[PDB]
């Protein structure tokens, strides 16, 4: 039907956006901290203490899949990168204080995001 070629399109939009956010959003990480998944063979208790792992490899593959059917969805991921850091390392850890300067930076380019997802109209 054409109304479904038309979601797709809106979906593919969204994708299109959501990877610049991406890209936005992994620039605020230059030590790579987050760039993948925590190695469970390097830190074989990591899933004790973390239910729900992520990190922005992981992210872009669900993008490029377009697994990502709203901002809501794409944001709850990002937060999960940033909220399992600062439960499983301390305050006073390189790994903690990325995450806080992560979250800080990232919120700037997410603001201006969900004014684009809304006035492009793609969800
Ligand atoms: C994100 N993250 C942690 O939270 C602590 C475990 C860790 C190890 C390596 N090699 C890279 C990143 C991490």
Do not use: W
């Amino acid at each position: 039907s054409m109304e479904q070629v038309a979601m797709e399109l809106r979906l593919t939009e969204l994708t299109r956006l959501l990877r610049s956010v991406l890209d936005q959003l992994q620039d605020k990480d230059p030590a790579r901290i987050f760039a993948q998944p925590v190695s469970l063979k390097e830190v074989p208790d990591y899933l004790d203490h973390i239910k729900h792992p992520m990190d922005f490899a992981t992210m872009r593959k669900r993008l490029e899949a377009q697994g990502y059917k709203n901002l809501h969805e794409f944001e709850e991921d990002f937060d999960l990168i940033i909220d399992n850091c600062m439960k499983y390392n301390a305050r006073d850890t390189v790994f903690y204080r990325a995450a806080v300067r992560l979250r800080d930076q990232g919120g700037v380019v997410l603001r201006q995001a969900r004014r684009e997802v809304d006035s492009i109209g793609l969800e």
